[PDB]
Every structure is written in structure tokens, then in C-alpha cells.
Design a binder for this molecule. Structure first.
Ligand code: HEM
Ligand code: HEM
Ligand SMILES: [Ca+2]
Ligand SMILES: [Fe+3]
Length: 712
């Protein structure tokens, strides 16, 4: 502890962000599942048993990777919490159709519809829950009896006194009731008025459009303070004074990248088959005819959706762990422990079986060829990005512990070398610890558990362990590599902004006001680091006239300019578009967020993983590596990306947003809406950009494939 204040710099922001996220985490752990709901007379229709068994069955079926609830999943099949609330609203429109109005929704004229939607609105929004029991009217009993026949188009001894399937729809009805009931002390719902159901009065409250602009005010405060702080005005070379970049376990690391790019290509095959599944889900041009039945049984949309997301995970994950363990032998200085290649291959094949087995379990449970107890563990887990079973999550994190074991083994010498408590060999070994550990948050998670805590612990990995990795490990690797070649804060600001801001997805899943405010504030503060690359991009544009024949690093800068470009675009200006509750209320679970997904995953981290696979370059000479396939890959991947985020997702997304604004979210998700001429033909011409993007993935894939003929 020579200069422990520099440790206290990170310790402070980390302790305050872990206090904020941990205690607002205690707030979303505290602030339900009624033991048994009853009728006005007495009879039961649902129990905690049925809601949690229907949750377990929901997680068995894997409906979260095909039909969204609370906005959190896939966007092919309609939202089974908005659609349920609308179908139950149609049930209340069918029920009271006796006295002061006609039969249908719009059969009664707007003049007399004024006396209609007041009675039901003041039926269930009044607190109807004590004793773990929800008490409901015989009206609501006949409603919950009325709604079930609706649940086609093109969308996927004695003990109890209910069915099993019944438990699923009881869990759906639970999501509906929990979504459409006011809080204690407050006049808004547990979901903060979600979903957008107009006829029950569900729209953002005061805090939403207060903090929506307070976030803008805080962001402009930050921008202003830095920009006016920049007034005082407080290089490794002059014009032409750069040195040459030359240095000569990694036999097996060459296969990690082949795995990586093959998984990237099949990830885009599942992306493309998910693309075709959103055009026609009744057949496949002969082989899957309604008489025949071939493709729809074995490899459905659920499977393409889970496997597209598990491939995106695994190809980028191997795409960075390969770089971690490829740059490992430079950290200690070649200091190889006993049987290191064998351990790296052990880890490699553990990754292989985790990868295969995980989405093979999804194969088995998503087609339901599996018991109840055997789902979740082996089968589909039921959650976006944790689609992989728990067996395989535990095994993946054991792969992360063998990786952190091997990386810590490959930095024991670096840990012995550093006398300074906050050295590069302390930050780049804090980052690897921050990676190899923080997938563990994802395991504090069970099928029979409450869902708020579950998703809290989900975005605790999917927007925390992803963000405290590519902006922390990759950057201390950047410093390390640019130090070792002779070329030469973000972590602290991005883990002060990003760690407590990760709650920006959790506004409409049971969060208190403090969590909304914190989320809003710190998600607003997530922009000011990502916008710093807005000048760094221009600086690059006015610095990239340097490398010639001798300089090996030519095209990776053309990767990284795009990385910074899309890192300004996809998250900074596209994430803060959706950050406000006023827009996220409606946007939550539309094609709008596919733009942010494809543009912030492949747009930022995909090209980064590709750049790190290309960092290939220390096994081939400077003037012998071929680079037409590089430009091919760039033009095709970026043209396909900008194509798929411009031609399709922007217009469909904004159309969907306007439809959600006007007719309602449930309508914006309904098949009557989602099968318009415009939208069907737009989803039909989405595949052009997909062809080009797959072409681009194939180009850079065949580059790294054909790298293997003449290597160093
Ligand atoms: C040719 C390549 C690709 C095609 C054709 C493709 C196509 C698709 C399609 C059609 C969807 C369905 C969206 C929906 O209706 O819900 C999807 C979802 C998704 N894709 Fe891709 N994709 C490709 C590559 C990628 C890559 C390389 C990444 C990331 C590295 C990526 C990340 C995602 C994510 C995250 C989602 C889901 C978003 C969510 O569930 O909320 N895709 N993809
Ligand atoms: C590299 C950085 C980032 C990545 C990889 C990323 C990734 C993602 C992904 C995949 C989703 C889709 C979740 C789902 O549909 O279930 C998402 C949602 C979202 N992200 Fe990000 N994000 C990043 C940065 C940001 C930033 C900086 C902001 C705000 C300034 C932001 C705001 C949002 C919002 C508001 C949503 C909600 C969309 C929805 O639930 O449908 N993100 N993010
Ligand atoms: Ca999603
Ligand atoms: Fe996020």
C-alpha cells in the first residue's frame, strides 16, 4: 500500500456503486406470489403452487425465447402480459354487456362508452390483496374462466385441484394481475403502469417524465462541466518518431479462433433462420409441407432464437477468452506452468461441451422431450442470454474458473513483479478477476424463485459482466499491448456509470422509484464516456494516414474506427433514446431494441472480437497476409449491418412504436397488426441485408480459415 489512494479511487466508485446496486438490489429483492387466490364466495382458481409451477413450466417451455412477458424476451410471438390484459379487457367487455352499453368494444358509441370503462377500471386497480391471498369478484372469476379459450395465424393418489397447463395460464394471469394493480401509498402499478393498456389508464407517472428530463439535465451538466473544465488545456512521437513493432502455449489458441469464427458463422445461420422464421412459420418450400412435417418439429423458432443468442454469447466469449489466454504468455514473460497446453485444451473442450450440451439441452426441452425436474438444469433455462441450462451455466462458470485459474497462473510472475499496488499488472489483473468472477451473479437464480430478483440477477450478468469486461479487460489489454509494442479512467467512469445504470432495463419489472431514479441518473451518466469517442473518431480520421508496407497494423484500425463509431451510435445515442421511461414504456420489447441489440453487440463488441481474432497477426508476416477479404468483410458486414438496421428494423420499429402509441402495445404485438403487407414484405426484404452480412461473415471467416496454409 504505497499509493493506496489510487486504489481508493476505484474502491470508492466500486463501493458506492455496489452499495447503490446492492441496496436498490435489496429494494428490488423486497419490493409477489400469493399462497392461494380465492373468489368472492370462496373457491380457488390459483395458488403460489400454480404460479411457481407455471413459472417452472414457462421456463420448461422456454416461452421467454419466443413470446415476451414484461417486454423481456423475443418479439415473434405476442406479449403474453399485454395480450392477456387485452383479452381480459375483452372478457370485461363481454361480461358487463347487459346494462349501460351494447355487446362489442366499439358497438356502443363514444357518447355512451363514457359510462363503460369507469366501472371495471375501479374494480381491480383498488388493492385486492391481503395472508398470502388475492380476493377477487365473481366477475373476475367468470373473466378468468372466459379468457382461456383464446389461448391462429403464424405465431408460436390426490393432492391439488388444478391441472398443470392451467398453472401456466395462472402464471400468465398472475403476470397480468401483478402488472395491472396499484402499489401501496402510490397511484401507479407494480410495473409502474406497464403495459400500455389505455382502457385501464396505464401511462408513465410524474417521476418518469421528471427523471426523463432530469437525466438530460444531469447529462448536460456532466458534458458542460467536462467541456468547460477542458478550457485550461492541462504523444510518444513528433512527426515521424515511432519505433517498429516486433516480437516473436499458443498452438491451441489458433483453434479457439476457428471455433470462434465458425460459431460466429452458425450464429448468423441461426440469425438468418430466425429471419426466415419471421417471414413464414407454416412451412419451408416443400420439405416442411403440411402433409409432411419435417423442419418445424426438430428445429423450431424457439431453438433458432435460443441458439442465435447462445452462439452470439459463445463466439464472442471464446473470441475474448482466446485473446485473454493468447496475451497471457506475454504477461508473465513466457512463464509456462506444468501441462499448460493440456489445461488450455481441457478448458477449450470444457467450453466445447458446455457450448454443444447447453443448446442441445435447449434442443431437447424446447421440443419437450424431457421431464420437469430435468429442465432448467439440462434443458432450456427459460431466460434470454441464460438460455443454456443451469448444469451448463455452472460448467461455463467452472470454465471461467479454469480460465481465471490459468490466467492467474499466467500472471503469478506479474503479481510477483509489481511493487506498485496500482500498476498495469494490478489493473489488468483486477479486470480478469472482474471477468472470471462476475458471471457468478447469473447463478443466484432458480426456476421456482420470484422473477424480479431473477431478472435483477440476470441483468447483473448480461449488462454488468458484459460491460465490466470489454471496457475493463480489453482496455487494460489495450494499454498492455500498446505498451509492449512501443505505442504508449474509462474503467472507473464506465463502472461508476454502467454498474448502477444497468437497472435501466428494470423499470417495468417491479422496481421502486429510487431504482428508476438511480437507473435514469447513472444510465444518463453512461453516455458521457461513450460520447468521448465522438472526438476520438475524428482524431482517428485525421490520424489514420501513417501505416504503410512495414506497419503490420493497417486494417485493425479500420476495425476500431468502426468499433468507436458504432460505440458512439448503438449505445450512447441509441441507448439514451430508449433510456427514458417515457419512450421505454412503449418501446419495451419492440423491433426498436433489435437495432440497439445488433448495433451494440456486433456493431461494438463483434468487430472488437474480430480485431482480437486478427490479433492471427503474430503468426503471419507483414507483407504476406492477404487483405482483399478484409475490405470484402468490412463492406459486406457493415453494409449488411447498416442494411438490416436501416431497411428493416428502423421503419418496422418506429411503425410498431406508433402502433403501440396509438392502438396499444398488445395491438402493436398482435398478429392482426404484425401481419400487414408493409411489415410482411419488409421482413421479406430484410433477408437481402442478411445475405450480404452472411457474405461478410463468410469472407472474414474464410480469411481466418485460409490463414492456416502458411503460418509462423
Ligand atoms: C446474418 C446475420 C444475422 C441475422 C440474419 C440476424 C437475424 C436476426 C433476427 C431475424 C432476429 C429476430 C428479431 C426478432 O424478431 O425478435 C435476431 C435477433 C437477435 N440478434 Fe441477430 N442476426 C444476425 C447476426 C447477429 C449477430 C452477429 C449478433 C451479435 C453479435 C446478433 C444479435 C442478435 C440479438 C441480441 C438478437 C435478439 C435481441 C433480443 O432478443 O432482444 N445477431 N437476429
Ligand atoms: C456496448 C454497450 C451496450 C450493449 C452491448 C447493450 C446491449 C443491450 C441489449 C442486447 C439490449 C436488449 C435487451 C432485450 O431486448 O431483452 C439492451 C437494451 C437496452 N439498452 Fe443497452 N447496451 C449497451 C449500452 C447501452 C447504453 C449506453 C444505453 C443508454 C445510454 C443503453 C440503453 C438500453 C435500453 C434503454 C434498453 C432497453 C430496450 C428493451 O428492453 O427492449 N444500453 N442493451
Ligand atoms: Ca429481448
Ligand atoms: Fe442496458
Amino acid at each position: 500500500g504505497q499509493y493506496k489512494k489510487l486504489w481508493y479511487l476505484l474502491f470508492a466508485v466500486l463501493a458506492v456503486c455496489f452499495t447503490i446496486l446492492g441496496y436498490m438490489g435489496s429494494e428490488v429483492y423486497k419490493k409477489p406470489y400469493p399462497e392461494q387466490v380465492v373468489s368472492a364466495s370462496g373457491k380457488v382458481l390459483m395458488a403460489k403452487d400454480d404460479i411457481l409451477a407455471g413459472q417452472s413450466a414457462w421456463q420448461t417451455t422456454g416461452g421467454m425465447e419466443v413470446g415476451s412477458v414484461l417486454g423481456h424476451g423475443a418479439y415473434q410471438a405476442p406479449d403474453w402480459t399485454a395480450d392477456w390484459l387485452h383479452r381480459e379487457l375483452s372478457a370485461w367487455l363481454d361480461l358487463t354487456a347487459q346494462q349501460t352499453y351494447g355487446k362489442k368494444f366499439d358497438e356502443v358509441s363514444p357518447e355512451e362508452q363514457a359510462v363503460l370503462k369507469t366501472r371495471l377500471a375501479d374494480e381491480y386497480r383498488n388493492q385486492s390483496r391481503i395472508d398470502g391471498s388475492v380476493v377477487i369478484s365473481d366477475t373476475r372469476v367468470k373473466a378468468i374462466e372466459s379468457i382461456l379459450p383464446y389461448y391462429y395465424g403464424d405465431d408460436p393418489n390426490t393432492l391439488p385441484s388444478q391441472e398443470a397447463r392451467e398453472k401456466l395460464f395462472d402464471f400468465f394471469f398472475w403476470t397480468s394481475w401483478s402488472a395491472s394493480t396499484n402499489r401501496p401509498d402510490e397511484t401507479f402499478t407494480y410495473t409502474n403502469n406497464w403495459p400500455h393498456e389505455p382502457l385501464i389508464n396505464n401511462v408513465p407517472t410524474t417521476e418518469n417524465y421528471m427523471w426523463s428530463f432530469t437525466s438530460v439535465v444531469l447529462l448536460l451538466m456532466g458534458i458542460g462541466l467536462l467541456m468547460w473544465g477542458y478550457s485550461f488545456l492541462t504523444e510518444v512521437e513528433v512527426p515521424t518518431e515511432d519505433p517498429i513493432s516486433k516480437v516473436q502455449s499458443q498452438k491451441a489458441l489458433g483453434k479457439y479462433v476457428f471455433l470462434t469464427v465458425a460459431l460466429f458463422v452458425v450464429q448468423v445461420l441461426l440469425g438468418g433462420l430466425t429471419a426466415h422464421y419471421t417471414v413464414e412459420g407454416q412451412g419451408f418450400y416443400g420439405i416442411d409441407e403440411a402433409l409432411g412435417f419435417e423442419m418445424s418439429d426438430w428445429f423450431p423458432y424457439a431453438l433458432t432464437r435460443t441458439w442465435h443468442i447462445q452462439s452470439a454469447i459463445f463466439w464472442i466469449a471464446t473470441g475474448f477468452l482466446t485473446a485473454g489466454l493468447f496475451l497471457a504468455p506475454i504477461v508473465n514473460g513466457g512463464k509456462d506452468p506444468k501441462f499448460q497446453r493440456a489445461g488450455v485444451n481441457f478448458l477449450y473442450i470444457a467450453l466445447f461441451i458446455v457450448v454443444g450440451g447447453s443448446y442441445a439441452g435447449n434442443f431437447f426441452a424446447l421440443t419437450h422431450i424431457l421431464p420437469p425436474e430435468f429442465n432448467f438444469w439440462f434443458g432450456h433455462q427459460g431466460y434470454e442470454y441464460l438460455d443454456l441450462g443451469r448444469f451448463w451455466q455452472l460448467l461455463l462458470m467452472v470454465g471461467l474458473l479454469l480460465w481465471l485459474f490459468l490466467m492467474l497462473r499466467c500472471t503469478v510472475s506479474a503479481f510477483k513483479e509489481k511493487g506498485v499496488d496500482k500498476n498495469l499488472l494490478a489493473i489488468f489483473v483486477a479486470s480478469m478477476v472482474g471477468v472470471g468472477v462476475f458471471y457468478a451473479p447469473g447463478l443466484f437464480y432458480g426456476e421456482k424463485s420470484p422473477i424480479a430478483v431473477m431478472e435483477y440477477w440476470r441483468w447483473w450478468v448480461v449488462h454488468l459482466w458484459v460491460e465490466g469486461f470489454f471496457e475493463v479487460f480489453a482496455t487494460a489489454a489495450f494499454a498492455f499491448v500498446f505498451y509492449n509494442m512501443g505505442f504508449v479512467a474509462a474503467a472507473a467512469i464506465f463502472m461508476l456509470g454502467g454498474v448502477p445504470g444497468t437497472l435501466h432495463h428494470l423499470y417495468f419489472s417491479g422496481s421502486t422509484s429510487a431504482s428508476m431514479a438511480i437507473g435514469a441518473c447513472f444510465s444518463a451518466l453512461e453516455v458521457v464516456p461513450l460520447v468521448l469517442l465522438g472526438r476520438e473518431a475524428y482524431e482517428h480520421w485525421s490520424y489514420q494516414h501513417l501505416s504503410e508496407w512495414a506497419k503490420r497494423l493497417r486494417w485493425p484500425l479500420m476495425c476500431f474506427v468502426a468499433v468507436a463509431f458504432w460505440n458512439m451510435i448503438g449505445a450512447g445515442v441509441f441507448g439514451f433514446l430508449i433510456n427514458p421511461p417515457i419512450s421505454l414504456f412503449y418501446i419495451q420489447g419492440l423491433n426498436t431494441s433489435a437495432v440497439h441489440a445488433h448495433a451494440a453487440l456486433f456493431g461494438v463488441y463483434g468487430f472488437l472480437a474480430l480485431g482480437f481474432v486478427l490479433l492471427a497477426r503474430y503468426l503471419k508476416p507483414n507483407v504476406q497476409f492477404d487483405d482483399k477479404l478484409m475490405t470484402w468483410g468490412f463492406w459486406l458486414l457493415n453494409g449488411g449491418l447498416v442494411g438490416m438496421i436501416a431497411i428493416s428494423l428502423l421503419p418496422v420499429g418506429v411503425i410498431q412504436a406508433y402502433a403501440s402509441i396509438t392502438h396499444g402495445l398488445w395491438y402493436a404485438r398482435s398478429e392482426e397488426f404484425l401481419q400487414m403487407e408493409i411489415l410482411d414484405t419488409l421482413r421479406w426484404v430484410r433477408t437481402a441485408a442478411d445475405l450480404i452480412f452472411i457474405g461478410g461473415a463468410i469472407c472474414v471467416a474464410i480469411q481466418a480459415t485460409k490463414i492456416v496454409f502458411g503460418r509462423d
